């Protein structure tokens, strides 16, 4: 129609194809004008069949349409970089926009923010050059084992297990090969628990129903090593949507969700990844970039609750558009 | 010499004619720029405007300041808060709206007490402020600050004597604070609120200045040590004012402002030459600063 909203869904030259293709099947052709662009390695703008200074091809599609809807992830996982061109562009986009994503990236602010709002978070310290090493009030606040990881970084790559207080010094310069900026987390343990938050048109913020996630078999029980997106790479994962679990301490959950998101200040959408510890629910990430291929978690925990993938897409364009 | 770069609302063309006067010409090559009057060719940037910040990280060049993520705490009166107090800092009681909500809960006004501020989060402390001394007043004073951010922060008033302090990064990493500066508009000693920010009292032409700031010695002490940790808590760059209010109840922190006057008339360049930092000497150290950080991570 002469009346439909037109929307770009922009992705890179693997998941990110795939995560577009989701996204193109079901945007609803009633209601969207819809085009398909590829980023080539080089960054040109290419169009591809949908079944200031920008890049080449970028000022066409752009002036071409209402809404883009950015595929945020690349090669090496996550990718927000298109965001701030986007910003830049004064074109709206569904995202989280570059503050939250910055924020969201950094493990230090993000954990600061959530803490200041009184959620929980697991305890931790963080090491700026030189300091490779940490006071003993530290070490018997932490206890063993801790994760050292770069406070900026994904993949869940320089980071270590360290057992004994001797192994920290190394482990420190393997992650800030990574990052100067370190983050020592004491070990957090338990079931690993996601909730989808979804922001609407008028800022209201609703939390999907709880998705669980199981990748240690003989062990029983998940910890916060490796990243909730590695361990969904993982052949070996089993996911439960819905999570089975009480109803109150789920309704508990999604309530800290919505927390957490307003805790950094998000807009659009986000995943927050839970651990159930001994002592209750920890917050171990709140990510900016959620999955768009229909068998990703975020999508995944949508549908579960009673919201399609159309419906979900159409809420976010909606809700970028009223911002 | 090190190629320099000043980039500059109308109190930014004025800030950038006093550092091309003080730049030790036989240590610096300058530049000035609205537009001349792209590169390179400049090794590094001091930026006095204004994303423009995140525009010269993409650029990969050294500049002057907080830059991204400080920025937007800086600017943002929550975030500012929130951050403060995580660190142990004293600040005042608030609480925020985000859309739809406009109402305040029970518990919200309950530690807010009267009379409270209302404030777009972000952007000065002058536009879509109000003053409610009465809860009916509340609905019409959020929905003036609305107009100018979706974002509203209800502020407990804080009041007392109002006294800045700035802070100053070393190349070696370490931060130092300046002397304080006090400022006194509106008939009293104490009376001054945090209604108006630091920067449009500076403009009043009732405002008096006491720099150094008449004040005790521990008391002084104590507050230049709360502006570093300030300082640290929003993880900022090169330079601060931080914004102070001597309360009945000690030292309350109402603002850190990451992009301080820069002319010779300033209140940060003036706390630092009651310091023995003269503005050439201020100037340069903070150019020595930034080369020696990055660019990239920290």
């Known amino acids: 129609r002469d009346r439909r909203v037109r929307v770009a869904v922009v992705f890179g030259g693997a998941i990110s194809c795939v995560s577009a293709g989701s996204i193109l099947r079901n945007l609803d052709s009633r209601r969207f004008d819809v085009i398909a662009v590829g980023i080539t390695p080089a960054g040109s703008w290419v169009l591809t069949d949908a079944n200031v200074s920008l890049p080449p091809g970028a000022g066409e599609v752009l002036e071409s349409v209402d809404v883009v809807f950015p595929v945020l992830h690349g090669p090496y996982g996550e990718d927000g970089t298109i965001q701030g061109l986007l910003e830049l562009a004064g074109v709206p986009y569904v995202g ?14 993000t954990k600061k923010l959530l803490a200041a709002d009184g959620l929980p978070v697991g305890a931790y310290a963080v090491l700026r050059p030189p300091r490779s090493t940490l006071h003993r009030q530290e070490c018997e606040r932490l206890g063993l084992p801790v994760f050292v990881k770069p406070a900026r970084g994904g993949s869940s790559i320089g980071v270590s297990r360290v057992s ?38 008028d ?49 508990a959950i999604r309530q800290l969700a919505i927390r957490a998101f307003a805790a950094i200040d ?21 990510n900016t970039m959620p999955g768009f291929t229909t068998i990703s978690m975020y999508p995944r925990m949508w549908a579960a609750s009673g919201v399609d993938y159309p419906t979900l897409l159409a809420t976010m364009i909606e809700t970028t558009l009223a911002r």
Request: hydrophobic share 45%; charged share 30%.
């Open 96 to 109: 989280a926009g570059v503050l939250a994503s910055a924020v969201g990236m950094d493990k230090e602010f």
């Open 164 to 201: 004994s207080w001797d192994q920290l010094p190394a482990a420190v310069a393997r992650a800030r090969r990574h990052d100067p900026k370190v983050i020592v987390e004491a070990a957090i343990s338990g079931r690993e628990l996601e909730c989808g938050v979804l922001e609407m048109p």
């Open 203 to 251: 800022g209201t913020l609703e939390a999907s129903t709880l998705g669980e996630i199981r990748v240690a078999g003989v062990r029983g029980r998940e910890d916060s090593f490796y990243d909730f997106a590695t361990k969904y790479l993982d052949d070996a994962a089993e996911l439960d949507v819905p999570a089975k679990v009480d109803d109150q301490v789920a309704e």
């Open 266 to 286: 998000c807009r659009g959408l986000a995943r927050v990844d839970f651990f159930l510890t001994d002592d209750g629910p920890v917050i171990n990430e709140i």
